[PDB]
């Protein structure tokens, strides 16, 4: 499982008789779906990207002059003109210059002089800019099933499947070989203000690293440099990269300010570098709110028998997985394929099944298997794998687990509630209340009523309501509220 490595891993449990489960997915985070009687999946957001974003405006730094010219006429003999004065891609300035005996003009006046030059800036020195298109952003969600095969932190499970998600496309169903189909139906978003973020990338270069940034629009839109739009030959306001010298009679020089790559790079020090891969422009924010339909899954390898209980050896001893769960790799030697009889018993009760398996029906296939992940109650206990037996104690302390589940539920409600608010009518209000209650206390209700069942839960709710109906102080009325809450969670 690729989720046995990430620092943050949210647990979501499939309640008994449940076929739908909501989710919240964010970058660098995965949620291990687990449901009773069904295989456990892994769901996470691989990466968010856009492809071939639109180009809005490309500044260029190193201006390249060419074919400059001047022209002047004797004083009081009409202004001077130039064939290149009125054409495009030019930067022309007018001025007056002294004159006298050495200029072959009679009177000691001051005539007109004109000087200007083509301005098309140097190639491979442009600073293009792109802006994301909100509706075209593509979100990638990849779902992996649980198999007994151990997976390294940087290895790809063969069964990994991918899925694309945009604003328009909503519902898509995947296939996972023999396990079945997972119905993904997600709604997307993007926290970063796409209107206030323009990606700036200067033309490809080997020495210059990095070659991309994310900058505020109100800054990239007011750079004191020449600027054009893609598909235009001439450059607007090219005069910002040419300095005209003083006139000497007939000639006035047109200088060049050189490239500006140094100044631009200096001005962008300490700014994030946007991830780029070929034609894919990645992002770094946003989250996907989604629901998964487990209805179409089938548990794998259920026809196999059970191997003998004396042919097992540890290859990776039990260790803390960082999320209050255990992981162990066991290698078999007898006939294959078959199931893996694994059980755990609390110290002092050596004849009760206590393990909460995460891997679905751990099995050994023709070639592959033996990775088992489990959750155990607080305190010491013994893990049984056939003949083998290992000692272990859990640090969770139950109450901490319940509190952490409540905190995670509150966080999920805060993150996802911004969009899941229905108040259209009485039905809408009821749906919103039910969704809030579920997203808040589903884990609490499941843990509180573990294996009790529907009829036992209804009986408990009825007893609590009857107790609440008894007359008492106003604070004592909370018994009815608790009974109703339990009934709704045990009946909805």
């Amino acid at each position: 499982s690729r989720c046995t490595h990430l620092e943050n891993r949210d647990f979501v449990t499939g309640t008994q008789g449940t076929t739908r489960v909501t989710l919240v997915l964010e970058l660098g985070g995965c949620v291990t779906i687990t449901a009773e009687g069904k295989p456990s999946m892994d769901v996470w957001l691989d990466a968010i990207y856009q492809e071939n974003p639109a180009k809005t405006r490309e500044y260029c730094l190193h201006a390249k002059l060419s074919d400059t010219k001047v022209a002047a006429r004797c004083p009081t003999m009409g202004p001077a003109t130039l064939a290149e004065e009125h054409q495009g891609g030019t930067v022309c300035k007018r001025d007056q210059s002294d004159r006298g005996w050495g200029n072959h003009c009679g009177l000691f006046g001051k005539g007109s002089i004109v000087a200007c030059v083509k301005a098309a800036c140097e190639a491979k020195k442009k600073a293009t800019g792109h802006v994301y298109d909100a509706n075209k952003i593509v979100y990638t969600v990849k779902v992996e099933p649980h198999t007994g095969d151990y997976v390294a932190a940087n290895e790809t499970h063969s069964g990994r499947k991918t899925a694309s998600f945009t604003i328009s496309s909503e519902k898509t169903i995947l296939t996972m070989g023999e396990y079945g189909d997972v119905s993904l139906l997600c709604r997307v978003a993007s926290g970063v203000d796409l209107a206030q973020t323009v990606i700036l990338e200067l033309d490809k270069t080997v020495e210059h690293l990095p070659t991309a940034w994310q900058v505020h629009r109100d800054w990239f839109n007011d750079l004191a440099l020449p600027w054009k739009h893609e598909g235009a030959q001439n450059w607007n306001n090219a005069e910002r990269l040419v300095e005209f010298g003083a006139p000497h009679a007939v000639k006035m020089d047109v200088y060049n300010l050189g490239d500006q790559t140094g100044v631009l790079l200096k001005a962008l020090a300490g700014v994030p570098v946007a991830h780029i891969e070929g034609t894919k422009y990645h992002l770094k924010s946003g989250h996907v709110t989604c629901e998964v339909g487990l209805e179409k899954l089938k548990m794998k390898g259920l026809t196999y028998t059970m191997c003998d209980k004396t042919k097992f050896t540890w290859k990776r001893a039990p260790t803390d997985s960082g999320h209050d769960t255990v992981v162990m790799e066991v290698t078999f030697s007898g006939t294959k394929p078959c199931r893996i009889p694994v059980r755990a018993v609390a110290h002092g009760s050596p004849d009760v099944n206590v393990a909460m398996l995460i891997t679905p029906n751990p099995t050994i296939e023709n070639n592959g298997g033996g990775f088992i992940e489990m959750q155990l109650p607080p305190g010491d206990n013994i893990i049984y794998v056939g003949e083998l037996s290992h000692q272990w104690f859990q640090k969770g302390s139950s109450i901490g687990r319940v509190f952490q589940k409540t905190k995670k539920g509150i966080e999920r409600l805060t993150v996802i509630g911004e969009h899941a608010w229905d108040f259209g009518s009485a039905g809408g209000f009821l749906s919103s209340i039910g969704k809030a209650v579920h997203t808040v206390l589903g884990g609490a209700f499941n843990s509180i009523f573990g294996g009790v069942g529907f009829l036992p839960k209804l009986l408990l709710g009825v007893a609590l309501a009857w107790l609440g109906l008894n007359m008492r102080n106003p604070t004592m009325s909370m018994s009815f509220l608790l009974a109703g809450g339990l009934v709704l969670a045990m009946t909805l």
Partner: protein, 142 residues
């Protein structure tokens, strides 16, 4: 070095080595005087070359010819070792901060906070709602 264009004028094409020399054109003499030339390239400046009478010396020019009309100069500016002024480019939990801001205000507003607390504790008579009143009283300051 000397080309006769089809527009009725002659253009003198000079390199770096040709500075401060005398080049013959048509029937007159052109004496190149500009000194900032260089090997030819795209960056070519071409300015009118003045023509002066027999007894007049040149002033404020760097290309003059005698008894020849319509002469233009032209020379590149590449290869020469290289006003390089540069343009000016200007550079560039949720309630935890609110709780931190409140704590900082209380720390730096000891007098006002103490006065509010004293007022509450001397005219509240609402121990049940004392916390509710104090929450608003403390969080009001922003």
């Amino acid at each position: 070095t000397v080309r006769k264009e089809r527009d009725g004028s002659t253009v003198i094409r000079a390199e770096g080595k040709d500075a401060a020399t005398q080049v013959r054109v048509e029937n007159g003499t052109c004496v190149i005087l500009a000194t900032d030339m260089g090997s030819w390239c795209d960056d070519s400046l071409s300015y009118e070359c003045v023509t002066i009478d027999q007894g007049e010396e040149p002033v404020d020019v760097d290309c003059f010819c005698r008894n020849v009309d319509g002469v233009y100069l032209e020379y590149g500016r590449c290869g020469k070792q290289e006003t390089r002024r540069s343009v000016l480019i200007p550079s560039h939990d949720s309630l935890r901060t609110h709780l931190t801001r409140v704590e900082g205000w209380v720390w730096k507003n000891k007098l006002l906070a103490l006065a509010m607390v004293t007022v509450v504790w001397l005219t509240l008579e609402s121990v049940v709602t004392r916390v509710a009143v104090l929450v608003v009283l403390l969080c009001l300051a922003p």
